[PDB]
Specification:
2 copies of one chain form a homodimer. The first copy, chain A, is an alpha+beta fold. Chain A contains 5 helices and 5 strands, in the order H-E-H-E-H-E-H-E-H-E. Bound molecules: the ligand O=C(O)[C@H](c1ccc(Cl)cc1)N1C(=O)c2cc(I)ccc2NC(=O)[C@@H]1c1ccc(Cl)cc1 (2 copies). Chains A, B: Belongs to the MDM2/MDM4 family.
Chain lengths: 96, 96
């Protein structure tokens, strides 16, 4: 989360089928996570498939990728935390 | 429009306050347009403010532009025709 209220970073959530598959494919193994954990695994993911741009590393390109289907965009910046979060929020259910 | 029938491109619409200002900001001067015209002005806007990705030209990076707020995305592909129509529709009222 970095600059997302730490309180919000610990928010307990249940990823929907598509996001859950993304997570487990990189090593995750629960059905319930904290936002901070999702970001972490989503972080490994980006890193392993190298969805980042070599010369412009803070920009991710997920056009022809499963991530692109979850987020619904061809690219985003890892510097804009609030936007990534809301993009992640649509692929899960917040456990109350 | 494209991938979208001509019957749909000619649909009559009334942009909402923000999209309207957006349109008039690039030379438009009506309060009601056809989808085809909105796309055209929106095309000039994108081009005029150089919002296209230099190395992935089919991607409109509108993250830090008012266009980002209206479309609700940090970016989008000009190949996703139906998605663009949807984003535009949310910003207007179809003149019945
Ligand atoms: O570790 C961080 O603090 C940072 C981060 C950036 C934005 C947000 Cl919302 C949370 C965390 N982050 C990265 O900088 C990062 C960037 C790339 I390019 C690749 C991996 C990576 N690793 C991270 O753990 C996160 C991160 C992971 C997934 C996503 Cl979608 C965004 C950022
Ligand atoms: O001219 C077209 O047929 C095409 C177009 C693409 C998608 C849709 Cl839905 C309608 C029209 N189009 C562009 O390819 C385009 C691309 C860029 I990058 C910049 C301008 C541009 N000009 C256009 O007239 C359109 C277009 C304009 C605005 C938007 Cl939001 C999307 C496409």
């Amino acid at each position: 989360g970095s600059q997302i209220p730490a309180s919000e970073q610990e928010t307990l959530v249940r990823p929907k089928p598509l996001l859950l598959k993304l997570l487990k494919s990189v090593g995750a193994q629960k059905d319930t996570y904290t936002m901070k954990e999702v970001l972490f695994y989503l972080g490994q993911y980006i890193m392993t498939k190298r969805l980042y741009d070599e010369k412009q590393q803070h920009i991710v390109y997920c056009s022809n990728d499963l991530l692109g289907d979850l987020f619904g965009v061809p690219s985003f910046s890892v510097k804009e935390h609030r936007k990534i979060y809301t993009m992640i929020y649509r692929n899960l259910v917040v456990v109350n």
